[model samples]
Target: MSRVLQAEELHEKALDPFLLQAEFFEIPMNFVDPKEYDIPGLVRKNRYKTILPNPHSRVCLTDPLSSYINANYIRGYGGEEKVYIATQGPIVSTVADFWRMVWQEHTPIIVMITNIEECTEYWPEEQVAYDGVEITVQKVIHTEDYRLRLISLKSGTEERGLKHYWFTSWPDQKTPDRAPPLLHLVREVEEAAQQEGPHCAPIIVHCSAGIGRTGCFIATSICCQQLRQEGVVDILKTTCQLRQDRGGMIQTCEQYQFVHHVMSLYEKQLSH
Candidate 1:
């Protein structure tokens, strides 16, 4: 296939150890272009006009009312289904649609890696209703790198638990100065997801555009799992998989290198 050949060609030119791998790995960053999916009314829902979700993996709201949600169901290592939902920070109009996707997907955890100001207030301070669902913040836990909010969602007497982790350390369109914080978040989120039950639903992760910081977060999660379970990491393959689900995953080459640094640090920690 052309994609495979494209990757192979870059692999030949890439030879700087980790970055060499990234060079080959980065080819499919947009293998699935946004132009491929042309859903109606999608423009208004996107945080950035160009970053669109891949159609095959895009999340479709099951509501009888409207079905479009600017989100994608991302896979984990070895093709585990729906491990995470990579999406953009909710714009003013799509705030309700964001929660609606959460309610329908039974999302147990939400990892918001962007600043609060970037997104509209989707969850209530005390309690608020959106559409028919009621969202209440039960408790707030502030950690070094992130803030954890214990929230409850109720709709027609069906209530569910959710953990919202606002990782304030990461800046938009850039990588964190260190890797430990992100590794900590990846481990913490995995622990929380495990507690959500056997059939844990996809953990929603979003940044401003859902492809930059959002991509880094999801890639870190998947690579960490792979390193822990397999004693090695295939970041190249992981990047390809992520872009397949959502165009522009790991938005820049720098963000791609950041993922490599994260896994490198993780591998060291595991050794000790």
Candidate 2:
């Protein structure tokens, strides 16, 4: 049986080693030509734009987009003309706080709640708390018609137009048993992206420190996008690029292994 590791225990087992080897394993930046296009700016303020590269303009890996992962906060697009927002913190209050920030911003926003199981012991029901906040904010953001959806990385209903999918195993399970069904989820996201459009919305993914499973999901999604566009696979190179800016990009060895598995699966499926 896999042990039920506390937040601290998981950190000790997974995160510590990554931190130690971070300097040596840093990924090099590989620049790619940006696909040029003209789009209206997402934020009103021009001063805040230059801090991060325009999400659309940057070709290859860009800077690590700084997010308020420790609290419920919102960052408006600077002059760069990008439309990606992120929020992370304690689930109990952070959910409400995030909506409050969104309401204040009044810009179109996409909400993705990752690691649903870790957020609350009683999910779907406990998720009601977030629903309550969403209801209140929906009324406020109604003028702008901002999109709000939640992504539950666990077993649950798809509420409020939010997509729900499970990946990780239950708390008390081990490898070969506990490892998340990540490849399946990656395919689902890719399909959804195809239907919704590439720049449909900014995906907010999280899992504990917004690193491990979240990183894998984001990295895999990037790989799929790159593969579809260029017919190539370079996840390790891509992940390393992301890690250069974000210290603990992939989180754990297990996550790295899962990423390889996801890519392998993608290759096999593509061949078939």
Candidate 3:
């Protein structure tokens, strides 16, 4: 018997037109190189030398002398503003700035998409002080694809609950072989977001460069919401929206195609 072509392979060909359309649009990828910033020590803060944030969407620290942090506020589905903050993993120096952003933005949840490569531990094992915020890891829950951490942030009597989701399944330079885990994460995160109360602050999401894997996660969340509400999904439009916020989102056509497959799997679940 001959082997049957997988649905994923067939879907890959169908994605060419959308991919071509996205490319032909020549969407303005507002990438600001670190060297462009005259501010001293700014270059060291970025994980990647070349992939920087777009100024308009860039998350500026309160410091007047230096406000550059390689992070951007990504709009959620339905054009909701500041739904997510997509950024690169914090290097040694930027770790403090990362916590500051979390405290300043009152970010309730952080979605980390990469494995810890270096000794740069953003969260302390128990309790540690960063800049002005006191971070204490309350609990760590491990799952098949990710780890959920219940962390608390305090500074001068003001305390907040923070949930950190470290997704370890999707490896560096590759996509997940299966789709259910990612979909499960998207739903779980959304549930947690809603539980945060009326005003759900922007959720922090990051990978290495904060564009490829990060974009896939954010795109999936938005598309899932869209599919559930509107009865359809538009990966192209969503990809364009993400790039508009931060350049090079959904970095490869393969990632884009993978997103479609994830959504299809999601639709199947919805049907059942």
Candidate 4:
């Protein structure tokens, strides 16, 4: 939790040799000093200073964000770029900006993993306006663990496609009773991404604070790709890599444990 801890100490805190499945708890996520950024003139911006986007990697909002979004782009497995956008829950004030980001970035998949109480009022309406952009929800599909929405976007004279997956059951900072649903969500999203072809956009993932569950989902997504391609999984390294991009990821020891559980279940399915 110490802000100034060196990389060696941080890595030690990040992994416990005896408890490989539990090392995520051992790792301390970065808790940055808000004084460092000192950004201003926006609603709820200061609330998420601990997880600010890296200056080098921060998504430069076409309009330049000065608010409480606290979003960043995290690399996917094997350093494939734009694999996921890790961000905090949007407040009522920033929904438009949030969608604007979606439109601007050409995001193909949006994975939201928080409940109604965890976030302020913000989801694309039948019609959503961002600066001068517009987002129209085309359809909504309900499943066991998520609600999927197909949406369309438009600007001055262009149009595009988008997908939104809203997962409402993950308890903040805890594991789900069963890991299958989470794995199932990962599979479905990745499959859809494949159908979209190789040039797909980064998947947008967010939870309440955009670290705990957000991290868990992103980690699972990366590990899935790793297991299939390299026939191995490196949760430890993935956790470290994510923290490098956006301070706190896979925020709790329990969440880390849950990720291991999910991966174990996935491997079992693959074996059969």
lDDT of 3 by residue, 181-272 (tens): 78889999999999988784899998778998899999999988888887777777788789889988888766766677688777767777
Clashes of 3: 0
The window of 10 residues in a row where model 4 has the poorest summed lDDT is 1-10
Predictions in order: lDDT: 0.76, 0.39, 0.80, 0.72
Task: Residues 108-197, candidate 2: write the lDDT tens digits.
Answer: 323232432453222243334432333312221111111223422211342233333333332222133233355555555556544555
Each model's Cα RMSD = 4.8, 13.8, 5.5, 5.9
TM-score, one value per model: 0.86, 0.50, 0.86, 0.84
The order of the candidates by lDDT, greatest first, is 3, 1, 4, 2
**Which residue segments of model 1 deviate by more than 4 Å?**
1-26, 31-40, 63-65, 115-120, 171-177
Q: Which candidate number has the best TM-score?
A: 3
Residue by residue across 46-68, what tens digits does model 1's lDDT show?
77777777778989886322787
Residue 95, candidate 4: alpha-carbon lDDT: 72
What is the TM-score (0 to 1) of candidate 4?
0.84
Error of model 3, residue 222, in angstroms: 0.5
Q: After superposition, how far is residue 172 of candidate 2 from its true place, in Å?
A: 9.1
